[PDB]
């Protein structure tokens, strides 16, 4: 027989979506464009392209949330606040996003492409520029479009 559910349920989608918004990973849901926005405090160490060991659990319900949708291209892009220069900053955020997409295709996505890139605070979501990775500007964002 053909399958009713594709290894996913809508109750589990909104259960992970409430749990990610309770742990502060903000899931925006516009049309079929999905955005999960992750502060860089909640994954890495400060001004580093290196994961903390506990933050792979945060990546676990990120990846188990990304199980649930039929998707074609995830793009993951990272940007933080200014530390030395924009050149050092863009090298940091490129390594940052490529490390988290290396873990995300180590884990389960059914995406066909993950595009991955980093920017040098070129798109900052607040004008308040407190510090390093504790800034809410300092974030990675994982955006995709849910196919059909």
């Amino acid at each position: 027989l053909p399958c009713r559910v594709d290894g996913a349920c809508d109750a589990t989608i909104i259960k992970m979506m409430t749990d990610l918004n309770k742990k502060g990973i903000k899931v925006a849901s516009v049309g079929q464009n999905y955005l999960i926005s992750i502060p860089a405090s909640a994954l890495f160490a400060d001004q580093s392209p290196r994961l903390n060991w506990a933050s792979y659990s945060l990546l676990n319900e990120i990846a188990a949330f990304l199980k649930q949708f039929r998707k074609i291209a995830i793009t993951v892009t990272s940007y933080s606040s200014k530390y030395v220069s924009v050149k050092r900053e863009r090298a940091l955020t490129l390594a940052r996003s490529r490390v988290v997409s290396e873990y995300l295709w180590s884990q389960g996505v059914d995406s066909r492409i993950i595009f991955t890139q980093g920017l040098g605070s070129d798109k900052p979501i607040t004008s308040y520029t407190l510090g390093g990775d504790r800034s809410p500007n300092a974030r990675v964002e994982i955006t995709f479009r849910r196919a059909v």
Binding site: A54, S57, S106, Q107
Partner: protein, 135 residues
């Protein structure tokens, strides 16, 4: 805590199958490297973008058929004169463009390209004329 990958070759046969997959896919690649004929961009023979403001207007065409009629029409859509040099063969040079939104100098790029060597396009933008040359 992190996990191993899900489809990971964590198995003594599947590592051998997947190292064979790595070796066959890159051996396909230096294959494709040695038989890939290219053209260098110094010597590509095709048209460029002739960057005139009438040729950067904003057009749309659905078509298959003979080439001199479209380039007559995109000359008088671009307010350009149309010259033909050469003689039209009994079989016509048959190209086809169906784009509903692209730039009309890049039509003339697509025209020259799908003509290939049966004909080619020249644009003189100071004289405001396109010209279609046969062989």
């Amino acid at each position: 805590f992190k996990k191993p990958p899900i489809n990971n070759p964590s198995d003594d046969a599947t590592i051998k199958l997947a190292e064979a997959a790595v070796s066959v896919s890159d051996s396909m690649l230096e294959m494709a490297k040695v038989e890939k004929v290219i053209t260098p961009p110094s010597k590509d023979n095709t048209l460029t973008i002739p960057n005139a403001y009438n040729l950067q207007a904003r057009a749309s065409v659905d078509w298959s058929g003979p080439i001199e009629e479209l380039t007559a029409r995109i000359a008088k859509a671009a307010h350009f004169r149309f010259r033909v040099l050469g003689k039209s063969p009994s079989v016509p040079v048959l190209i086809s463009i169906s784009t509903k939104d692209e730039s009309l100098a890049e039509i003339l790029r697509d025209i020259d390209y799908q003509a290939g060597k049966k004909a080619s396009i020249h644009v003189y933008p100071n004289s405001q004329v396109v010209e279609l040359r046969y062989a």
